C-alpha cells in the first residue's frame, strides 16, 4: 500500500517564564 | 494495499519567550 | 498489505509569551 498520512502536529510549547523585575523606582 | 499507519506526532514546540520586564518600582 | 508509516508530523508552535515581570523595588530616599 501507499505510505500512511503525515503524523499529527507537535504539541505547542510550554508558556514562557515570567519576566524579570522592573528597575528600582525613582529617588525620593 | 491500504494506506500505512499515520506518522509519528511532531516534536513538541519550544518554550515561549520570557515575559516582559516588570514596571518600575514606586518612588522612594 | 498496508503501506509503510507516514512521515513525522510538523514541529509544534513555540509556546506563549511569559507573563509580565513584577515591579522593581522602591526607589532610594
Å from C24 to nearest chain B CA?
4
* Calpha distance A23→A21 (Å, rounded): 7
Expressed in angstroms, the distance from the first to the final Cα of chain A is 77
Q: Do B15 and A16 touch (CB under 8 A)?
A: yes
Task: Enter the resolution in angstroms.
Answer: 1.5
SS percent in chain A: helix, strand, coil, step 5: 0, 0, 100
Q: Measured between beta carbons, which residues in chain B are less than 8 angstroms from residue C18?
A: 16-20
Q: How was this structure determined?
A: X-ray
Q: For residue A16, how far is the Cα from the chain centroid?
A: 5
Q: For residue B6, how far is the Cα from the chain centroid?
A: 24
Nearest CA in chain C to B4: C3
Amino acid at each position: 500500500g501507499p505510505p500512511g498520512p503525515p503524523g499529527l502536529p507537535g504539541q505547542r510549547g510550554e508558556r514562557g517564564f515570567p519576566g524579570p523585575p522592573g528597575p528600582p523606582g525613582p529617588p525620593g
